[PDB]
């Protein structure tokens, strides 16, 4: 709930830890545009953790949300903003032509339309510098062969729905194992020994026993694989102990 | 660019040749209800040949 | 009845803004694309734009994009053309008109009464 986002090549990024994912508090909201999550199903957040999870802000023309997707390309998603192939998040854009719109024009939005080369996923240009086209050395005015590259947006509420500024939001979280601070209001039990019961720390359900070995784990670790990549020892994000996970008779 | 297309039973086909692929020029056009391609994706259209 | 009426002569000096106005009545000013096509003394028509009564879709001329500008007030049904920065070479014959029951969305069937606008130094 802000008035106004960010440029499309300035895109903020807002960095959350130490937080309780409650996503119910999103549902509630207008019916967006496209709410589809790329590497996990949206129902599934609240019961989930998260190691880093990054907040995207931006507003484009509105046709262009097809272009926030990986393996997509074009104008914003070769010189603004860019999805790798290997993207875990979700994508939430909804019509924002009452909010980010003037019947006069809004011109406080840009989109880089000239760029020297295609941008890295993940990254932010806000080069103001006349992009140089033609051979002879720009001197940074606007020439022939060398104009402003950065356009401006021409929002207006006449246009119908498809010109219209659409805010969207990218969440980017890491659903790795690692040790994470985030995982919502799901509530503590207590912790038995020898015997064969059901265990859930951040996120990893499954059925086994634990041990208390002698692992020596870093700070920075908390889950260990065996062969197989079957997490077989975790740590406890409460105590400092260490369990191993062992499968029942 | 037209004023007026023709009906539904005497639906008019356009021959394309002998010109340049740039779908491009599309986008900035009037916004399109459902613009769903089957057979190729919608951004590999201005870099494909016809 | 369907009429349309417009504003008075308006005689003004180059660099100085002018708004000039035609309203029409006797039919729902909702649905019929107003324009405004200009006249020089001795030349012929030419176009520079029309609007949309209910939402602004302006097509202006490729000769008259950044030139002029055109607006309507859908609440009392009354078309406006803005001017900045006139020039001396903008003194001439402007109509409004609007398209009719038939034939297409730019035949522009009716006309108004026009306008006499004229500039000097």
């Known amino acids: 709930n802000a008035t106004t986002f960010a440029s499309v090549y300035a895109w903020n990024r807002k960095r959350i830890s130490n937080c309780v994912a409650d996503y119910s508090v999103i549902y509630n909201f207008a019916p967006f545009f496209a709410f589809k999550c790329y590497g996990v199903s949206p129902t599934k957040l609240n019961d989930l953790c998260f190691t880093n999870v990054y907040a995207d802000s931006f507003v484009i023309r509105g046709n262009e949300v097809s272009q926030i997707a990986p393996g997509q390309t074009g104008n914003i998603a070769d010189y603004n903003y860019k999805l790798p192939d290997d993207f875990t998040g979700c994508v939430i854009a909804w019509n924002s032509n009452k909010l980010d719109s003037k019947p006069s024009g809004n011109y406080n939005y840009l989109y880089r339309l000239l760029r020297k080369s295609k941008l890295k996923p993940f990254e932010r240009d806000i080069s103001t510098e006349i992009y140089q086209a033609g051979n002879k050395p720009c001197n940074g005015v606007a020439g022939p062969n060398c104009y402003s590259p950065l356009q401006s947006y021409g929002f207006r509420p006449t246009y119908g729905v498809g010109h219209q500024p659409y805010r969207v939001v990218v969440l980017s979280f890491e659903l790795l194992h690692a040790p994470a601070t985030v995982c919502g209001p799901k509530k503590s039990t207590n912790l038995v020994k020898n015997k064969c019961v059901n265990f859930n720390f951040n996120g990893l359900t499954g059925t086994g026993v634990l041990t208390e070995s002698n692992k020596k784990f870093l700070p920075f670790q908390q889950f260990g694989r065996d062969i197989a990549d079957t997490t077989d020892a975790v740590r406890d994000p409460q105590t400092l102990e260490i369990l191993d996970i062992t499968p029942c008779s | 660019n037209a004023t007026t297309f023709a009906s539904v039973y005497a639906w008019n086909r356009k021959r394309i040749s002998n010109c340049v692929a740039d779908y491009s020029v599309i986008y900035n056009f009037a916004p399109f209800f459902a613009f769903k391609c089957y057979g190729v994706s919608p951004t590999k259209l201005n870099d494909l040949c016809f | 009845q369907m009429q349309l009426v417009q504003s008075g002569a308006e005689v003004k000096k180059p660099g100085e803004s002018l708004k000039i106005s035609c309203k029409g009545s006797?039919?729902?000013?909702?649905?019929?694309?107003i324009g405004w096509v200009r006249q020089m003394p001795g030349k012929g028509l030419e176009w520079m734009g029309i609007?949309?009564?209910?939402?602004?879709?302006?097509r202006y001329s490729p000769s008259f994009q950044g030139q002029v500008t055109i607006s309507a007030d859908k609440s009392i049904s009354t078309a406006y053309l803005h001017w900045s920065s006139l020039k001396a070479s903008d003194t001439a014959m402007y109509y409004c008109?609007?398209?009719?029951?038939?034939?297409?969305?730019?035949?522009?069937?009716?006309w108004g009464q026009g306008t006499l606008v004229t500039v000097s130094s």
């Open positions: 008109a609007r398209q009719g029951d038939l034939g297409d969305w730019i035949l522009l069937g009716y």
């Open positions: 609007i949309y009564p209910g939402d602004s879709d302006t």
């Open positions: 006797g039919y729902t000013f909702s649905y019929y694309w």
